[PDB]
Amino acid sequence: SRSIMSSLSITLNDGSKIPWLGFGTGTALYTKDAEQDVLRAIANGIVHLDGAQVYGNEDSLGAAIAASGKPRQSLYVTTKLAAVPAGQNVRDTLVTSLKKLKLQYVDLFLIHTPEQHQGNLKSVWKQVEELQKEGLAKSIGVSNFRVQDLEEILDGASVVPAVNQIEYHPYVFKADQPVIEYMKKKNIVPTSYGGLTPIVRFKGGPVDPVLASIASRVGTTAGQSVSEGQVLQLWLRAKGIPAITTSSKEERIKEYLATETLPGLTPAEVQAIDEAGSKAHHRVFSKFWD
């Protein structure tokens, strides 16, 4: 049965392994849908589940884990700090998350965005470092942090964030080159959300014929049909960047799973996607980056 051990994973700077393929509750409107989506993801073999405080779906993620019958120790669970409610501290929010998730610890706890902690980034990160010492979060990281934001929290830090979860796909490749290079020097692993943006929101752009050509190649090598969407995930796999996905259709979930083991892209293929993506800038989330 699929588990963290039995799945493709990426090693973090603290020694632990995060599964390369993840599934996120995202901005799912109804918790009833969110629960069924996570159940579908676990049942089809995804073992990395991404939640957040701010969208209220931790309860459904916890209920789905309990209802799936899969041992919690087989699964990697992430959640993310929203704004700190008045009269509370960071630890208070994680205790609340863990009660909703029905867990004793999360595998990964992230600051969801620097925009919610303006003037307090150093303080918040120190609090997150203490939550790792306390045993409530195995690994700690950030989300949507620019180079400027990382410099701020790294000044006088005892722990370097294990990951920076960001929007990442070919249409932000050119703009993100500085933060990607910075993270590589500090050994911060980027993780991707929004990986299918080019073909879901901007179909008809310059990357499409490149994806079509590469999908035909990968499919010929593998002996099965391969989609443009699967090539976008192989692009992330080739860069060592975990892909957090969002679609709930069992047919698409099975497509995602296949990308874990499809033939990898060659250097010329990755470069061709980099180039074609660099012909357009389309940033869908965290617009303060622009």
Nearest Cα neighbor of 16 from 82, 106, 88, 87 is 106
**Phi and psi for 97 in degrees, rounded to 5?**
-60, -45
Q: Which residues pair with 164 in a beta bridge?
A: 142, 190
The answer for residues whose C-beta is within 8 angstroms of residue 82's C-beta and 6 or more apart is 52, 53, 54, 93, 112, 116
Residue 185: Cβ within 10 Å count: 7
Asked if residue 51 lies in contact with residue 22, where contact means CB atoms within 8 angstroms, the answer is no
For residues 282 and 71, give the distance between their C-alpha atoms in angstroms, rounded to a whole number.
39
Closest by CA to 84, choosing from 119, 41, 40, is 119
Domains of the chain in start order, with CATH, are: 9-197+236-252 (3.20.20.100)
Distance CA 233, CA 248 (A): 16
Which of the residues are catalytic?
55, 112
Q: Helix, strand, or coil here: 102?
A: coil
Cβ count within 10 A of residue 155: 10
CA 119 → CA 116, 142, 212, 286, distances in Å? 9, 16, 46, 18
Count CA within 13 A, CB hemisphere, residue 61: 30
- What is the Cα–Cα distance from 285 to 283, expressed in whole angstroms? 6
Q: Residue type for 242, please?
A: P
| Tally of residues, the chain | 290
* Amino acid (one-letter) located at 12: L
Experimental technique: X-ray
Q: Cα separations (Å) of 110 from 84, 125, 127, 209?
A: 13, 10, 12, 36
Name 245's bridge partners: 23
Burial annotation 17-37 (CB, 10 A radius, 16+ → b, else e):
bbbbbbbbbbebeebeebbbb
In terms of Cβ atoms closer than 10 Å to its own Cβ (0-12, 13-18, 19+), residue 73 is exposed
Distance (Å, whole) CA 163 – CA 139: 9
Tell the residue number behind the tokens 């080159």, with chain if given: 177
Tokens of 209: 């014929």
Q: Which helix (H) or strand (E) holds 65?
A: helix 58-68
CB distance 287 to 175 below 8 Å: no
Contact call for residues 230 and 204 (beta carbons, < 8 A): no
Strand partners of residue 17:
11
Enumerate the β-bridge partners of residue 76: 48
> What DSSP element (H or E) covers 250?
helix 250-259
- Structure tokens, 7: 């799945």
Sort strands 21-24 and 48-50 into parallel, antiparallel or unpaired.
Answer: parallel
Please, what is the Cα angle at 168 between 162 and 169, to 5 degrees?
150
Rounded distance between C-alpha atoms, residue 101 and residue 79, angstroms = 9
Secondary structure of residue 204 in the 3-state scheme:
coil
Closest residue by Cα to residue 134 from 153, 106, 101: 106
Q: Where are the beta strands (DSSP E) in 208-256?
A: 243-245
**Structure resolution in Å?**
1.9
Separation CA 24–CA 9 (nearest Å): 17
The maximal CA–CA distance of the chain, rounded, in angstroms, is 59
Give dist(CA 213, CA 159) in Å, integer.
Answer: 43
Contacts of 92 (CB under 8 A, 6+ apart): 84, 85
Distance between CA atoms of residues 24 and 34, nearest Å: 9
Distance CA 84, CA 93 (A): 7
